[PDB]
Amino acid sequence: GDTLSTIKAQENQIGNNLSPGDTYPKKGLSPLALNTMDQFSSRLIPINYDQ
């Protein structure tokens, strides 16, 4: 019930175009990694020992 983080996408995770019925990354590509927490994509997303 604990929200670990809320992260607004940074430059690495922004999709330029997304048409109706499309998907970013497009169908046939791999998912994108959301692995940073701060504004400049320089800090990773941590968790506790109990988490």
CB of 2 to other proteins, least distance (A): 5
CB of 46: closest distance to other proteins in angstroms?
8
For residues 12 and 48, give the distance between their C-alpha atoms in angstroms, rounded to a whole number. Answer: 25
Site for other proteins contains 5 (CB under 8 A): no
What residue has token string 């940073």? 36
Closer residue to other proteins (CB): 40 or 49: 49
Q: In a 10 Å sphere around its CB, with 0-12 CB exposed, 13-18 middle and 19+ buried, how is residue 13 labelled?
A: middle
Site residues for other proteins per CB under 8 A: 1-2, 48-49
